[PDB]
Amino acid sequence: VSEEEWNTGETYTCVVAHEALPNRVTERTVDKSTGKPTLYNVSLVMSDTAGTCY
Amino acid sequence: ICEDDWNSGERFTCTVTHTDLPSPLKQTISRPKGLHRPDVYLLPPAREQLNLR
Numbered sequence: 695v696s697e698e699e700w701n702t703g704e705t706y707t708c709v710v711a712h713e714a715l716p717n718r719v720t721e722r723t724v725d726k727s728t729g730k731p732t733l734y735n736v737s738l739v740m741s742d743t744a745g746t747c748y
Numbered sequence: 749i750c751e752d753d754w755n756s757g758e759r760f761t762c763t764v765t766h767t768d769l770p771s772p773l774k775q776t777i778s779r780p781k782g783l784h785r786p787d788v789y790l791l792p793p794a795r796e797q798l799n800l801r
């Protein structure tokens with residue numbers, strides 16, 4: 695894939711079919727931001743941490 | 749009155765006679781002479797009640 699088409703985003707999926715896979719088919723995916731990135735941007739927020747929990 | 753008077757032990761009488769009922773009706777009132785102290789706790793609102801917003 696041309697380098698302009700990868701630095702946009704563009705999720706690609708690889709589907710394989712084989713006689714020992716569960717539903718006979720599996721698939722993976724990658725884009726610019728998931729696979730081997732140079733930037734990990736977590737942003738987590740916890741809220742109502744006291745709460746009333748049973 | 750003054751509050752030492754009701755606190756004293758002296759009784760207080762309300763004396764009324766009526767026309768049809770000629771006899772005086774004595775109401776003799778006093779505080780019952782003859783003790784612990786309270787322990788005020790203050791309990792704060794539940795968490796459930798505040799989660800109703």
Ligand SMILES: *[C@@H]1O[C@H](CO)[C@@H](O)[C@H](O)[C@H]1NC(C)=O
Binds near residue numbers: 734735737
């Ligand atoms: C890094 O995290 C901060 C805090 O949320 C955020 O404002 C900033 O944009 C992030 N930078 C990158 C490069 O992800």
Ligand SMILES: *[C@@H]1O[C@H](CO)[C@@H](O)[C@H](O)[C@H]1NC(C)=O
Binds near residue numbers: 735737
């Ligand atoms: C990192 O994440 C924050 C929150 O979503 C976002 O505002 C920020 O722009 C991100 N950084 C980059 C470089 O996109």
